[PDB]
């Protein structure tokens, strides 16, 4: 038996700058891991 | 002062309405922010002066000394911003969304 | 609340008046709990730092079980006082303002007639 450990897809949702993505909110992208931006 | 302390107070509210509604340049806020400190300094000095409360005159100035540095910090942030974005415009400050 | 009380010690931990109260028995369940609370802190530390959980820092384990407990006796000693002040204060008022807290007579059930709702 393999109690189902979460796969990649279950993990994917928790990425993104907002859990429950809105209409325009989803357009956003996760913050840079280094806390420094490219602009 | 009965109505001379209402002009200064409304000056502070007109300066309040200013700092709270931004528009482009950040400097205009900071500058506005200072308009309040002047109004507070004037009102504190005015009442202290007509209450003959000399023990309190220290405050009118302590208010300015702390307000000046406060502004110093504010401007260094401003210079830091138009070094990172080439402008003081607030819209630029929208990365933390 | 209890601050502003007459005689309040402006920054003191436990005013000497608290001497009058009994000292907390060192084995008071609470102080013993603090002890266990402490031992666990110690054990937990060892764990988070990846050391043999129980067989390590046997000096630290002692510092912990003995720091927490030390703290307890002197804290409980106070919290005990605070509660004791509360009664001094509360009971006193009940008297100084007696009319407001009047003794009441409770009619023997014989007299009182609570209604009976039948279950049926």
């Amino acid at each position: 038996a393999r109690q189902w450990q979460p796969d990649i897809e279950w993990a994917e949702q928790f990425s993104g700058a907002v859990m429950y993505p809105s209409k325009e909110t989803a357009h956003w992208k996760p913050p840079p891991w280094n806390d420094v931006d490219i602009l | 002062m009965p109505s001379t302390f209402f002009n200064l107070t409304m000056a502070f509210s007109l300066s309040l309405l200013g700092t709270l509604m931004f528009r482009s340049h950040l400097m205009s806020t900071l500058l506005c922010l200072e308009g309040m400190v002047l109004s507070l300094f004037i009102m504190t000095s005015v009442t202290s002066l007509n209450s003959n409360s000399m023990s309190s005159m220290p405050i009118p100035i302590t208010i300015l000394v702390f307000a000046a540095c406060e502004a110093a910090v504010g401007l260094a942030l401003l210079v830091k911003v138009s070094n990172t974005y080439g402008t003081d415009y607030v819209q630029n400050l929208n990365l933390l969304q | 609340m209890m601050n502003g009380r007459p005689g309040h010690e402006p920054l003191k931990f436990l005013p000497d008046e608290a001497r009058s109260l009994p000292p907390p028995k060192l084995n008071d369940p609470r102080l013993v709990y603090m002890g266990l609370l402490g031992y666990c802190t110690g054990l937990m530390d060892n764990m988070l730092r990846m050391r043999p959980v129980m067989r390590a820092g046997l000096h630290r384990q002692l510092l912990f079980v003995t720091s927490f407990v030390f703290a307890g006796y002197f804290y409980l000693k106070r919290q005990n006082y605070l509660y004791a002040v509360k009664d001094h204060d509360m009971f006193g008022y009940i008297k100084l303002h007696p009319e407001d807290f009047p003794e009441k007579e409770k009619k023997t059930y014989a007299e009182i007639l609570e209604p009976f709702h039948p279950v049926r």
Binding site: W33 | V73, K80, V81 | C40
Partner: protein
């Protein structure tokens, strides 16, 4: 930082709240607030990343205007009573200003927008100070003036904060902002009981500090600002998975852990004072806070998220340890409940 500067700043960030608390002349309370504002801004931009300058410039403007409003209240009082300090007689509007202003510096309710954003752009460390050693100062000023403030407003800011904090948190996935949102919420409970029993505000704060300080030093042990990042905790450092689980459920009000006491006694005090309307709604959405806490629980502990091969490399190397404070503040926090009577 030239270690000298580090000292001057840190001293100010620490003299800042302490002057506020110790003094009675409100003016001296205002400059205590002013020094905290000046000291925190340098540390906030330590990385000097583009996000950081944004953080500080917001924090500063929000802090500065509130500071000016607090001063106006003191200036107005000076003319309604010669005293430099709020008294029974104080005009009601004078006090309400101080509530709004101080509720902006503390960031409660409809002024809760700056905190989540500054908590997002500052380091985890300076995040803690910005959340917990900067709330002590303003709260002190409020707790001192509690007898005089309005029960209605506080309650509205209290309830609003609870809701905003909860709702905001549900969507957030960045940890720094999840904590910012929690702080808004807990800050709400604290200000709810201020008019009735200030002494409980000081409990609902300490417990928040004894809960949040371990929680953040946990987030940074692995410096994870993402839940996905904290979820691989099981590989990076397995032991903290157990206590991270209890501390987060403790932050929410679940009964065996220490976190229930602040909510329980605040509810007991509000019902003693008859707010069984307000208290009920607060407790209910308080339950929303646990949902997002447990969703994190799921990712970090109850379920094991997939990790990266390069992680095996980080395991090899000895993990720099978590300070002792973590333990002493994790246990005193996760389980002191059996000792509640003496805490209150």
């Amino acid at each position: 930082m030239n270690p000298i500067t580090l000292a001057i700043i840190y001293f100010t960030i620490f003299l800042g709240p302490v002057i506020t608390m110790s003094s009675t002349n409100l003016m001296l309370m205002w400059v205590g607030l002013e020094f905290s504002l000046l000291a925190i801004i340098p540390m906030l931009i330590n990385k000097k990343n583009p996000r950081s300058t944004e953080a500080a410039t917001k924090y500063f403007v929000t802090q500065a205007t509130a500071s000016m409003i607090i001063l106006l209240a003191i200036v107005l009082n000076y003319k309604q009573l010669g005293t430099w300090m709020f008294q029974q007689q104080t005009n009601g509007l004078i006090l309400n200003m101080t509530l709004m202003a101080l509720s902006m510096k503390l960031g409660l309710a409809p002024f809760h927008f700056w905190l989540p954003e500054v908590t997002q752009g500052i380091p985890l460390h300076m995040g803690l100070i910005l959340l917990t050693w900067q709330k002590i100062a303003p709260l002190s000023i409020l707790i001192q003036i509690y007898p005089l403030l309005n029960s209605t407003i506080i309650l509205m800011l209290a309830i609003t904060s609870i809701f905003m904090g909860a709702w905001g948190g549900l969507n957030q996935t960045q940890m720094r902002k999840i904590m910012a949102y929690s702080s808004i919420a807990h800050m709400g409970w604290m200000l709810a009981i201020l008019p009735y029993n200030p002494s409980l505000t000081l409990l609902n704060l300490m417990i928040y500090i004894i809960l949040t300080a371990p929680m953040f030093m946990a987030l940074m042990l692995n410096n994870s600002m993402t839940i996905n990042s904290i979820s691989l905790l099981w590989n990076k450092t397995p032991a903290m998975l157990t206590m991270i689980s209890l501390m987060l459920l403790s932050l929410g009000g679940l009964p065996p852990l220490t976190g229930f006491l602040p909510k329980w006694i605040i509810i007991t005090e509000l019902m003693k004072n008859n707010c069984l309307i307000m208290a009920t709604l607060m407790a209910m959405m308080a339950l929303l806070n646990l949902f997002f806490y447990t969703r994190l629980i799921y990712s970090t502990s109850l379920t094991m998220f997939p990790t990266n091969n390069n992680s095996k490399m980080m395991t090899h190397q000895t993990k720099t340890k978590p300070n002792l404070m973590f333990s002493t503040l994790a246990i005193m926090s996760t389980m002191t409940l059996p000792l509640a009577p003496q805490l209150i």
